[PDB]
Design a protein around this ligand. Structure first.
Ligand SMILES: [Mg+2]
Ligand SMILES: [Mg+2]
Ligand SMILES: [Mg+2]
Ligand SMILES: [Mg+2]
Ligand SMILES: [Mg+2]
Ligand SMILES: [Mg+2]
Ligand SMILES: [Mg+2]
Ligand SMILES: [Mg+2]
Ligand SMILES: [Mg+2]
Ligand SMILES: [Mg+2]
Ligand SMILES: [Mg+2]
Ligand SMILES: [Mg+2]
Ligand SMILES: [Mg+2]
Ligand SMILES: [Mg+2]
Ligand SMILES: [Mg+2]
Ligand SMILES: [Mg+2]
Ligand SMILES: [Mg+2]
Ligand SMILES: [Mg+2]
Ligand SMILES: [Mg+2]
Ligand SMILES: [Mg+2]
Ligand SMILES: [Mg+2]
Ligand SMILES: [Mg+2]
Ligand SMILES: [Mg+2]
Ligand SMILES: [Mg+2]
Ligand SMILES: [Mg+2]
Ligand SMILES: [Mg+2]
Ligand SMILES: [Mg+2]
Ligand SMILES: [Mg+2]
Ligand SMILES: [Mg+2]
Ligand SMILES: [Mg+2]
Ligand SMILES: [Mg+2]
Lengths: 53, 180, 52, 348, 222, 118, 125, 147
RNA sequence: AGUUCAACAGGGCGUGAAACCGUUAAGAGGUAAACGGGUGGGGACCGCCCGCCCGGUGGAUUCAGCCCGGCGGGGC
RNA sequence: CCGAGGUCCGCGGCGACGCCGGCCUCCCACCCGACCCGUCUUGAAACACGGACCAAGGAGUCCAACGCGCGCGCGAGUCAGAGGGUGGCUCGCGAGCCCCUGCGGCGCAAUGAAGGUGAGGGUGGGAUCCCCCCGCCCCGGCGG
RNA sequence: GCUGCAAGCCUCGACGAGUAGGAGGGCCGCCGCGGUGGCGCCGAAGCCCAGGGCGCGGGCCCGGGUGGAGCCGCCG
């Protein structure tokens, strides 16, 4: 029953630094973004870049 | 579904005294504690008999109590009976008994005490002998009631010796056809 | 009528017994009545014993 | 039984009078609410009048059933005529204006006789309950300020002749709160009992047991809730109202003294009753805590087991590793040699 | 003092629990290699007979696993009494039966209602591990710890769950107490269905005796 | 004889309230107003009664005296504790714990003092 | 005024157990009556008929008689009956009876606010 | 009363505890002791053998005060006197013996069932059995007759 | 219009249920109507962070330990 | 931590009714299920009977005696039944209290048509209990 | 810490069809009585309700409307 900060973080093999992801939710739906890094909470650090999309 | 019969699931055993007697239910609360934690086989039999009805706790005559005391090895042991100790006018001597019963009749109380005896209640028995050590648990003649003379095969069967239900015992009362 | 072992009963209720049923509701009232009669008789025979 | 303290007598005020009375043994008789409720059920049944319907009710009709052949329902119908009554059901209990089912007859068993020894047994338990502060307060009587629960007053109370003398005594003994409780309860009865001379209902106040009537009954007569009783004739219906024990009883010194001879101690039988004595206790020590916590009983019982054994939820040993090595310690060694078997290590 | 004798005993029972922990370890380790020797021995006996041109008839199986396949309504009174003595009172429950002429003729007389066979070690092992429940005091208690087996079957030398597996797979002098200690295995419905329930296994159904094919039925019901 | 008296008023008493699948006892010396042998306030020789003062300030602690058993006018002693929360709880906790007076009602009395001070 | 604990009250059935054929007659009230007819569809529990209340529908003993607010209802008639809920006010809520007057209903709401006791019908007049 | 009555739990049940096939009707087998020889014969013969027929002589004007003979056994013989009386004469067995007049106590005949304590006693009764007398004679004492 | 606290007490008049009926409001209607289970829509009336301890902070403490004096109470 | 069954020491948009919530119940709609109850009957949805609708009424009672079970009192006794006594100018209270040299009933003796006569432990199983012996002890007990 | 209404509370395991019929429980319901605890012209009983709820259920509580003088809980 460890806290969320102590849970182990999963990450699919298809998500490596530099892959092009497709956001399915939010306001940037379908926008193809660039995956940079996975943060400590498992959430992915995603950039557009801004000057593209 | 499970191939079982639920006919004998309810074990018909009295688990509490049918009576609303305040003093009897305190003895039940006193001996339910001893039956749980004392781990003595005597306190378990007393707990059953504290539940039982009047017919299952028949009177114990003074003479019958004395005979079971005069048996070998019962010198200083106390006579325990969950019920009443009735006096027996047929017996003459009382050998200084030490009884413990729910009730003792006035003459059985006077004759036991006059002989130098000691009458105890089941709260004193639990106080002086919680394990039930040094006791002789006695019961009355349960089959001594009149209803058991009518219990049997049937009055109109061979080798019956069963008492029929007749209004009066006389000459013209069920003695003509089948009794000779 | 007979079900199992039991007495052969003989209730004598084959007449019109409901027409002749005496209830003892005045039993304590006749005790007060008979008591007043002894007291009333006692004053009438004041010196003499009341029992007769 | 042997717990017979020295009860003090109180004067016309709420203070002691210097006199002391030994507690009668009747107040140490076995308290049997089941016996009191049994005798009260049948004793209160003996003062009731018989009620019954008329034997002719519903049978004043010369009704004959029309039989079959008509759409009518084969019930005895009233003879013909030019009235509404003609052609109506007359006898059955389902018919309007007919005879009720099993009409209430006046010769039912209205009165129940109780064994004289059981009447006295219930009275011994009712008096013993009036000497306990718990049973009198739980009864409903406001005695939180009276000087003593068995309340014995001087014999001059029997000589009272005016109500103001009686009301002032009840104020000195602080028993007046039990009478203000009666005033606060005087209300109207719920139901059709008001149509039957039972309109106003109230509560029960302190009962006053006397010995010699020198005017005490007329002095306390006009006070609501007050019940006056001679010590020789104590009614259980008034000393155990509603079948409940714990009636607030204000005793007189003359009545408190004579109470010892009316029922007698266990040592000497009663002198005012032919061949009677108090019931015997089937339990001398009624304090279970004194028995259980005694030295001899504590030496006989095991230590109390206070380890609640929950249900051990079963996990699959074939899927879960730690519950398998808990059952089969060798499984870890067998698993290690089986995991190493999938490693291509070259032997000699 | 009392605290000293209780702490000394607490450390003594803690030390006696480790030697019993090692006892059931080497015992389960010796049981495992016995299963290997018994498996390799039947191969050696079969090989030496074929090399001489003869045949090696293995010992007839001494253990059986009986599964009640038919329901409870409409049972013949003779078959109904036999299923009660096999502790098979509902559908899809399993028991181990020590095979002898007294047992085989009971399995033949209740044949249309059961589907039994010869369980292997994996069947006996997985049934007592996944479906294993003990009868402690007429109660169905899950075999979650070896203390529950040692408390009841400790007199028979069965103190661990591998002792219960070894005493049943290789039936021993204490098979009756060990098998009766195990509550009837409440098996699930056969995943994948059955061929047909009202027919014998030889004629295309499932009832009767399937020699070693009962293991296929166990993997699908357990 | 409390165990004897409990069997008499466990189901029949003027202070007992039975409704809504619940039961409550309204005797003045009941801490939790609970119908139980442990909490009944007129049955034992040692009862702890805790009520608010005549004014809305303080807590009057009622203790059943040893000699006032059959004398209701001189059966209880009134102890008015009009202090802060910690001081009032400390006074009642020492009356129960350090006098060994009805120790089974220690926390039940502390929760009642803490209740009538709000 | 929150309760001590507010668990998830799971109810096995929220519909009433309406009496069989109570829709076809006004004389047949919706109050449940066990059908005892020899050919009754509901008694024989045929498929698609009215359900019969059995003990299987019993609610969890931890949440029985528990109001949606988590409290347990207790009827009161005066401020004396209100002070019995002083202790255990995190599990039982008071409910002023219907037959009380508006004058006495104001005193109970005032006293319950002091004792931190919840009233289900505070403003009822 | 009617609160604990069985009819209170039969409300709603049609046949009221008397069956649908065989209803509860008005005397389906006769009234009273009907058919005691024809269709209730098995019940009468099984539970009341001897119910039918005559046995013995008839006594027209039988007066129970003529055959009044209350009996008492020897085990309850000393109950007619006080316990102190039986003990006082036990220490004086050399001739002073108590007299137990059984007639004035309400009995006529003395039967010798129980054992008698080893004390001489003079028993006055209207009748004595053979064994009652010899037990009184054997224990010491006489059996005085009275009318 | 008027009397009455009230005509939701107007004369077979206290309360005024059900069946039945008029009207209004709302919706629906080719498988007689109703009914069980599941859900959907609509409608009518409703409904809706604190406690303990501790750390500092800045204002008030008929201010605390302890002592003294008086009183009360407690025990296998 | 693959260990005596769950926690987050993770979080988002809306929160004063406009755009939030109301299981069930009201209306409506759809899918699945679904023949009218009662009754007798082997078998009822029956082309078997009763029932147009609604309200109110409407059917296991009381008495006697018996049986068994249970509660209670006392106990080889038990019940006081008719009656009597009396808190005395009698409410509640036609209750309750009290004593009847306890009449009598039913028990304490049966058996015979009657005249009549009239009742002295053993073995086996057995709750419980008693004693002895050997270990252990937390001195109270536990084990054999 | 909580309970200990011991007729209470807690733990574990298995089980659950039913006419005729039997038994048990009922803080189901109705009328009156002895007790006890109340309620009411600031509005009881009864009646009505597309309001809020409780109980497996029998039924119950609350709110609103109407009504106008009595009524209810608990132990028997
Ligand atoms: Mg018959
Ligand atoms: Mg016609
Ligand atoms: Mg009429
Ligand atoms: Mg009414
Ligand atoms: Mg079949
Ligand atoms: Mg077939
Ligand atoms: Mg519901
Ligand atoms: Mg309807
Ligand atoms: Mg049928
Ligand atoms: Mg039925
Ligand atoms: Mg019929
Ligand atoms: Mg019947
Ligand atoms: Mg027939
Ligand atoms: Mg008949
Ligand atoms: Mg009006
Ligand atoms: Mg009007
Ligand atoms: Mg009108
Ligand atoms: Mg309309
Ligand atoms: Mg329209
Ligand atoms: Mg609703
Ligand atoms: Mg029919
Ligand atoms: Mg036919
Ligand atoms: Mg047809
Ligand atoms: Mg017709
Ligand atoms: Mg009706
Ligand atoms: Mg019979
Ligand atoms: Mg007699
Ligand atoms: Mg006679
Ligand atoms: Mg069933
Ligand atoms: Mg009536
Ligand atoms: Mg409606």
């Amino acid at each position: 029953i460890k806290a969320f900060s102590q849970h182990r973080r999963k990450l699919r093999k298809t998500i490596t630094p530099g892959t092009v992801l497709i956001m399915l939710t939010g306001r940037h739906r379908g926008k193809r973004v660039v995956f940079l890094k996975q943060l400590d909470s498992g959430l992915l650090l995603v950039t557009g870049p801004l000057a593209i999309n | 579904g499970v191939d079982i019969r639920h006919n004998k699931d309810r074990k018909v055993h009295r688990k509490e005294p049918k009576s609303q007697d305040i003093y009897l239910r305190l003895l039940v609360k006193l001996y339910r504690f001893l039956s749980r934690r004392s781990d003595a086989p005597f306190n378990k039999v007393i707990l059953r008999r504290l539940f039982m009805s009047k017919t299952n706790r028949p009177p114990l005559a003074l003479s019958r109590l004395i005979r079971k005391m005069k048996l070998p090895g019962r010198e200083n042991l106390t006579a325990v009976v969950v019920g009443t100790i009735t006096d027996d006018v047929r017996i003459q001597n009382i050998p200084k008994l030490k009884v413990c019963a729910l009730k003792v009749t006035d003459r059985a109380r006077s004759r036991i005490l006059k002989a130098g005896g000691q009458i105890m209640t089941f709260d004193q028995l639990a106080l002086t002998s919680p394990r039930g050590r040094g006791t002789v648990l006695l019961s009355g003649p349960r089959k001594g009631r009149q209803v058991y003379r009518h219990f049997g095969k049937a009055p109109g069967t061979p080798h019956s010796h069963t008492k029929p239900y007749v209004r009066s015992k006389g000459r013209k009362f069920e003695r003509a056809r089948g009794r000779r | 009528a007979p079900s199992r072992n039991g007495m052969i009963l003989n209730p004598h209720f084959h007449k019109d017994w409901q027409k002749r049923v005496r209830t003892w509701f005045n039993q304590p009232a006749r005790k007060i009545r008979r008591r007043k009669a002894r007291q009333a008789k006692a004053r009438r025979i004041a010196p003499r014993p009341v029992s007769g | 039984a042997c717990a017979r303290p020295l009860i003090s007598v109180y004067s016309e005020k709420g203070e002691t009078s210097g006199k002391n009375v030994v507690m009668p043994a009747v107040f140490r008789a076995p308290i049997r609410p089941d016996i009191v409720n049994f005798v009260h059920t049948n004793m209160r049944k003996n003062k009731r009048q018989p009620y019954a319907v008329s034997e002719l009710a519903g049978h004043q009709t010369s009704a004959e059933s029309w039989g079959t052949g008509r759409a009518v329902a084969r019930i005895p119908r009233v003879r013909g005529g030019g009235t509404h009554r003609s052609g109506q059901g007359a006898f059955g209990n389902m018919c309007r204006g007919g005879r009720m089912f099993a009409p209430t007859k006046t010769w039912r068993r209205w009165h129940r006789r109780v064994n004289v020894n059981q009447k006295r047994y219930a009275m011994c338990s009712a008096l013993a309950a009036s000497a306990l502060p718990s049973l009198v307060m739980a009864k409903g009587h406001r005695i939180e300020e009276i000087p003593e629960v068995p309340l014995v007053v001087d014999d001059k109370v029997e000589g009272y002749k005016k109500t103001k003398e009686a009301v002032l005594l009840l104020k000195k003994l602080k028993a007046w709160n039990d009478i203000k409780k009666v005033y606060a309860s005087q209300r109207m009865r719920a139901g059709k009992g008001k149509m039957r001379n039972r309109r106003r209902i109230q509560r029960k106040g302190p009962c006053i047991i006397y010995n010699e009537d020198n005017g005490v009954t007329r002095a306390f007569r006009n006070i609501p809730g007050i019940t006056l009783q001679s010590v020789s004739r104590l009614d259980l219906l008034k000393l155990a109202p509603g079948g409940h024990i714990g009636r607030f009883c204000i005793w007189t010194e003359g009545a408190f003294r004579k109470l010892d001879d009316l029922y007698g101690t266990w040592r000497k039988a009663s002198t005012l009753k032919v061949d009677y004595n108090l019931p015997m206790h089937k339990m001398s020590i009624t304090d279970l805590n004194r028995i259980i916590k005694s030295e001899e009983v504590q030496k006989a019982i095991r230590p109390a087991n206070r380890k609640i054994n929950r249900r051990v939820f079963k996990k699959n040993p074939l899927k879960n590793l730690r519950v398998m090595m808990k059952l089969n310690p060798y499984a870890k060694t067998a698993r290690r040699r089986a995991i190493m078997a999938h490693n291509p290590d070259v032997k000699a | 003092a009392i605290r000293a004798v209780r702490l000394k005993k607490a450390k003594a029972d803690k030390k006696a629990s480790k030697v019993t922990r090692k006892l059931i370890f080497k015992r389960a380790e010796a049981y495992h290699k016995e299963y290997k020797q018994l498996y390799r021995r039947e191969i050696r006996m079969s090989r030496m007979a074929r090399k001489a041109g003869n045949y090696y008839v293995p010992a007839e199986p001494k253990l059986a696993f009986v599964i009640r396949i038919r329901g409870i309504n409409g049972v013949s009174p003779k078959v109904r009494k036999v299923l009660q003595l096999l502790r098979l009172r509902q559908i899809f429950n399993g028991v181990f039966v020590k095979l002898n002429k007294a047992s085989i003729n009971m399995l033949r007389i209740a044949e249309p209602y059961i589907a039994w066979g010869y369980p292997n070690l994996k069947s006996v092992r997985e049934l007592i591990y996944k479906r294993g429940f003990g009868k402690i005091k007429k109660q169905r208690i899950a075999l979650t710890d070896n203390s529950l087996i040692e408390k009841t079957l400790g007199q028979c030398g069965i103190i661990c769950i591998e002792d219960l597996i070894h005493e049943i797979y290789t039936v021993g002098k204490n098979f009756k107490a060990a098998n009766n200690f195990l509550w009837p295995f409440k098996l699930s419905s056969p995943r994948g269905g059955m061929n047909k329930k009202t027919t014998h296994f030889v004629e295309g159904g499932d009832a009767g005796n399937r020699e070693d094919q009962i293991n296929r039925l166990v993997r699908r019901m357990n | 004889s409390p165990h004897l008296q409990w069997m008499v008023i466990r189901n029949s008493s003027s202070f007992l309230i039975k409704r809504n699948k619940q039961t409550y006892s309204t005797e003045p010396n009941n801490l939790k107003a609970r119908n139980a042998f442990r909490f009944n306030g007129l049955i034992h020789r040692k009862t702890i009664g805790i009520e608010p003062a005549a004014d809305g300030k303080g807590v009057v602690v009622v203790l059943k005296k040893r000699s006032g058993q059959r004398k209701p006018a001189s059966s209880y002693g009134k102890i008015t504790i009009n202090k802060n929360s910690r001081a009032t709880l400390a006074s009642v906790r020492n009356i129960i714990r350090k006098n060994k007076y009805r120790r089974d009602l220690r926390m039940a009395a502390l929760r009642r003092v803490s209740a009538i001070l709000s | 005024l929150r309760p001590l604990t507010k668990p998830k009250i799971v109810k096995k059935r929220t519909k009433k157990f309406i009496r069989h054929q109570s829709d076809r007659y006004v004389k047949i009230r919706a109050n449940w009556r066990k059908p005892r007819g020899i050919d009754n569809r509901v008694r024989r529990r045929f498929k698609g008929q009215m359900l019969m209340p059995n003990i299987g529908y019993g609610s969890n003993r931890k949440t029985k008689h528990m109001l949606p607010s988590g409290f347990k209802k207790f009827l009161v008639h005066n401020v004396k009956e209100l002070e019995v809920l002083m202790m255990s006010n995190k599990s039982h809520c008071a409910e002023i009876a219907h037959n009380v007057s508006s004058k006495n209903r104001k005193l109970i709401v005032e006293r319950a606010a002091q004792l931190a006791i919840k009233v289900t019908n505070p403003n009822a007049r | 009363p009617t609160k604990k009555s069985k009819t209170r739990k039969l409300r709603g049940h049609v046949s009221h505890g008397h069956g649908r096939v065989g209803k509860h009707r008005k005397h389906p087998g006769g009234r009273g002791n009907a058919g005691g020889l024809h269709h209730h014969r098995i019940n009468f013969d099984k539970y009341h053998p001897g119910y039918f027929g005559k046995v013995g002589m008839r006594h027209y004007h039988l007066k129970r005060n003529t055959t009044f003979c209350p009996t008492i056994n020897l085990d309850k013989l000393w109950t007619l006197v006080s316990e102190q009386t039986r003990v006082n004469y036990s220490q004086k067995p050399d001739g002073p013996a108590p007299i137990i007049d059984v007639v004035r106590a309400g009995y006529f005949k003395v039967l010798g069932k129980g054992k008698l304590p080893k004390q001489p006693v003079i028993v006055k009764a209207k009748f004595f059995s053979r064994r009652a007398e010899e037990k009184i004679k054997g224990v010491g004492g006489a059996c005085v007759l009275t009318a």
